Amino acid sequence: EEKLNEIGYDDIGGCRKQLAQIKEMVELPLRHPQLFKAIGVKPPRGILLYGPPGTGKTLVARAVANESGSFFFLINGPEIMSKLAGESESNLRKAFEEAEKNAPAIIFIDELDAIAPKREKTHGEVERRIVSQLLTLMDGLKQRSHVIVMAATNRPNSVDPALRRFGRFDREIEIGIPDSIGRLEILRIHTRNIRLAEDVELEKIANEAHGHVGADLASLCSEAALQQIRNKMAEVLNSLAVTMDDFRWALGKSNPSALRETTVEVPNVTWDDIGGLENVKRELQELVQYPVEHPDKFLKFGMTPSKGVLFYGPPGCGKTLLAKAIANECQANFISIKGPELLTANVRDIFDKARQAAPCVLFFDELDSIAKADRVINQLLTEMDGMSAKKNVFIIGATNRPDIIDGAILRPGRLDQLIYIPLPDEASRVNILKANLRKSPIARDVDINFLAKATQGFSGADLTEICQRACKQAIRESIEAEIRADPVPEITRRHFEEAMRFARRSVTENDVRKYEMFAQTL
């Protein structure tokens, strides 16, 4: 009782932008109705929160209610649907009547898809009755009454379309997987009572906890604390403090439930990691950054920003790292979609998730798998064709066979600019080598400049693999020396020499000429 009435914004983690949105949408209207009524802002009536399970979207409504001083009423879908025919209707009606009786109030309908699934899923007559009663109650909320209905679901498609119309649920907020900062916030919240040793660095755990949601991180802390019992099992109880090794063990064996869900975050890849050419850097900056950062010039000179690119070139890491870097430059969200993912209605969903994030780079890797000289490609054409050119969403394609791409996806207004990504030059190769080996020690004798001079035409994967091989050899001698017995603390020159013998190339001039002729034809 007391605990639930004392959770606020600090006790919810992983959603800080959405939390600010909801604060502005709800708390301010319910604290100063006079101002909004005077200026003429209509407070929202229905807010549908959706996202993967375990994201903490079940606490947002209660946090807002507690921090705004508004009466909070909770409706559980399973609880309503577990009652008899008339009792469920009575409970819904009583919920809304009580909310109106004491206002301002917030009504939270957990698992809305249980009460109001798609009409096809519903088979009986009582279920349609409860859906219709919910619609009637929603439409019965006067603009004066200060009742805001908040609903939680996994996918809004699972809810009956009649509920998502205007006046019932017109605002939808997605509370998705948290980023590194969100994961760190969640870990701090969950470790508020667990005693931790002096060697815990929650930042590393947050950075390495990919595909984790709030619920998963709670399990990770529980598992890490459990092992501290195993190793150590009054004085024993007092000497218990979770250690970094326990956290690493827990993270290694944890199966996150959100590995397959697309991520939307600003990538941590900069220009220096990849290097790149000045021409391509300037071109990408012109195409993307200026519309986002300098719209005044654009409107002044009255041009519509062209918002489509088709990266084409050799097949390595070149095109995707460039897209992530340009996204990082503008602090814009990055959405990466591969051909296999699309091949396996989802096109509209991905475009909607792009439109939700205003500055966004939508990457379509392996575009050839879809656009080739049938249902999916038409969907991509129509969805992108009906994309307003005044919205800061940039669609960046990528294909290693630019001659198999149909002309429909290159028709101006869809993707009107083609950029070539050549084999990295000497400076680019130096940058790639340094970036790959940053997280490993290198003997002072090893000179990356000479290696870059020797490596001509090696693709990005090659340099990564050359580094992996030279390292893989280092582990072998480390074990071999250990078995014989830090005899080998650094990756000396000999390791790179013997790792630079059976590495020849991955794409020779034989296929470079293909792209270099395609360039001349364009």
Ligand X SMILES: */C(=C/C(=O)Nc1ccc2oc(-c3ncccc3C)nc2c1)c1ccncc1
Residue 181 class from Cβ within 10 Å (0-12 exposed, 13-18 middle, 19+ buried)?
middle
Q: Is 320 annotated to bind ligand?
A: yes
Interaction of residue 502 with a copy of itself, rule CB under 8 A: no
Q: What is the Cα–Cα distance from 73 to 147, expressed in whole angstroms?
A: 10
320 binds, among ligand X, a copy of itself, none (CB under 5 to 8 A by kind): ligand X
Nearest residue (CB) to a copy of itself, 451 versus 474: 474
Residue 272 Cβ vs a copy of itself, minimum distance, rounded to whole Å: 19
Task: Return the residues of window 312-331 that contact a copy of itself according to CB under 8 A.
Answer: none
Closer to a copy of itself by Cβ: residue 297 or 453? 297
| Angle, CA of 434, 437 and 441, to the nearest 5° | 120
CA gap 427, 66 in Å, rounded: 57
| Residue 111 known to bind ligand | yes
Tokens 């390292």 -> residue: 471
- Per CB under 6 A, does 320 bind ligand X? yes
Q: Closer to a copy of itself by CB, 427 or 506: give it.
A: 506
CA distance 59 to 55: 9
**Residues near 131 by Cβ (< 8 Å), separated by ≥ 6?**
115, 116, 119, 122, 160, 162, 163
Shorter beta-carbon distance to a copy of itself: residue 440 or 456: 440
CA–CA distance, 9 with 509 (Å, rounded to integer) = 59
Task: Work out which of 28, 74, 461, 512 binds ligand X, going by CB under 6 A.
Answer: 461
- The answer, yes or no, to whether the previous bond of 315 is cis (omega within 30 of 0) is no
CA 476 to chain centre: 38
With binding defined as CB under 8 A, does residue 465 bind a copy of itself? yes
Residue 243 binds: one of ligand X, a copy of itself, none (C-beta under 5 to 8 A by kind): none
Tokens of 450: 């000479």
440 makes contact, choosing from a copy of itself, ligand X, none, with CB < 5 to 8 Å by partner type, with a copy of itself
In the block, which residue shows the tokens 């590393």?
Answer: 204
Told to check if 506 binds ligand X by CB under 6 A, we report yes
Distance CA 300, CA 416 (A): 22
Within 381-440, the residues that bind ligand X by CB under 6 A are 407, 410-412
Give the one residue of 19, 173, 177, 221 binding a copy of itself; rule: CB under 8 A.
221
Q: Is 211 in the site for ligand X (CB under 6 A)?
A: no
Q: Which of residues 96-115 bind a copy of itself (CB under 8 A)?
A: 111, 114
Residue 382 among known ligand-binding residues: no
The residue (of 124 and 386) whose beta carbon lies closer to ligand X is 386
User: Is 110 among the annotated ligand-binding positions?
Assistant: yes
How many other C-beta atoms lie within 10 A of the C-beta of residue 375?
8
Residue from 309, 326, 330, 305 nearest 388 by CA:
305
From CA 70, how far away is CA 64, in angstroms rounded? 8
Separation of alpha carbons 102 and 98, rounded Å: 7
Query: Is 8 one of the binding residues for a copy of itself (CB under 8 A)?
Result: no
Calpha distance 419→102 (Å, rounded): 62
Q: Strand, coil or helix: what is 401? A: coil
CB 506 within 8 A of CB 464: no
* Of residues 68-87, those binding a copy of itself (CB under 8 A): 76-79, 81-82
Residue 105 has φ and ψ, to the nearest 5°, of -145, 155
Q: Does 54 bind a copy of itself (CB under 8 A)?
A: yes
Q: CB-wise, 426 or 516, nearer to a copy of itself?
A: 516
| Residue 390 binds a copy of itself, judged by CB under 8 A | yes
35 makes contact with a copy of itself (CB under 8 A): yes
Q: Which does 132 bind (CB under 5 to 8 A by kind): a copy of itself, ligand X, none?
A: a copy of itself
If the CB atoms of residues 128 and 372 are measured against ligand X, the closer one turns out to be 372
Residues 8 and 23: their CA atoms lie apart, in Å, by: 11
Touching ligand X, residues 74-103 (CB under 6 A): none
The number of residues that bind a copy of itself (CB under 8 A) is: 108
Q: Does the annotation list 477 as a binding residue?
A: no
Handedness of CA 97, 102, 105, 111 (dihedral sign): negative
**Which of 247-255, 263-271, 420-428, 509-517 is the region at the interface with a copy of itself (rule: CB under 8 A)?**
247-255
Pick out the residues of the known binding site for Mg(2+).
58, 110-111, 320, 365
**Binding interface with ligand X (CB under 6 A):** 315-317, 320-321, 407, 410-412, 460-462, 506
Pick out the residues of the known binding site.
58, 110-111, 320, 365
